[PDB]
């Protein structure tokens with residue numbers, strides 16, 4: 001009568017999200033005295049982010065994790081979290097609280113249910129920063145005319161355009177070559193993903209722009225969740241909440257470690273002045289009006305309430 005629950009996700013061994021799911025597995029095993037077992041299938045072993053979330057939504061997999069921008073393959077409401085400067089690291093504990101215990105978390109539960117899903121962990125996945133191979137970036141104006149790799153996220157593209165940059169959507173697999181060969185001048189990502197992907201080798205400058213925020217959303221198929229005994233639901237819910245407390249902290253530690261690696265490898269990491277941050281915020285705010293008709297005002301308001 002052991003319950004085997006399969007959990008797929010895209011992330012590499014030792015990544016902050018992976019470690020969170022290892023913690024989740026451990027806690028589910030402890031709380032259930034081994035009666036419930038999470039079977040981990042990381043590093044895209046069951047497919048890409050979209051493939052495994054499709055499977056979780058349809059019920060051929062019990063659980064999957066998708067980045068918040070990729071949750072756009074499934075619903076549009078999640079776009080709220082991609083808006084430039086809707087959140088900043090200073091207010092992160094309040095954001096977490098609101099997701100964990102507040103109206104925001106309840107709304108997100110409702111949205112997930114509408115697409116066949118039950119949230120279990122809102123894994124931290126960090127704030128992206130601009131980096132370059134050769135052109136020094138220390139100011140907002142330094143970003144003008146920079147050729148910058150993007151994902152296929154429309155908000156990412158619009159942000160770059162708003163800052164006067166020249167966005168080029170390139171697949172992840174083509175990105176290192178593009179940086180190395182000079183078909184783009186830079187990119188925007190977390191230091192840990194860049195260091196872990198060894199893009200560090202080809203970079204020379206970084207700014208703490210923090211111009212995008214994202215999470216990695218661990219979801220369970222809702223019909224499957226609703227089929228479980230209450231005690232097993234509770235074990236999963238609690239394991240998720242507890243693992244997330246560790247995962248958010250581990251993320252901070254790994255991001256520090258990645259920034260130190262940048263500095264060790266000779267990358268100049270500029271701490272933006274107040275004046276320059278404010279330019280980034282104001283230049284990117286028109287993006288919110290561009291996408292206004294696609295993101296519910298109520299959701300924007302719940303996220304903004306966490307930042308006051």
Ligand SMILES: [Cl-]
Nearest residue numbers: 032035036232
């Ligand atoms: Cl049990």
Ligand SMILES: [Cl-]
Nearest residue numbers: 151152170171
């Ligand atoms: Cl892409």
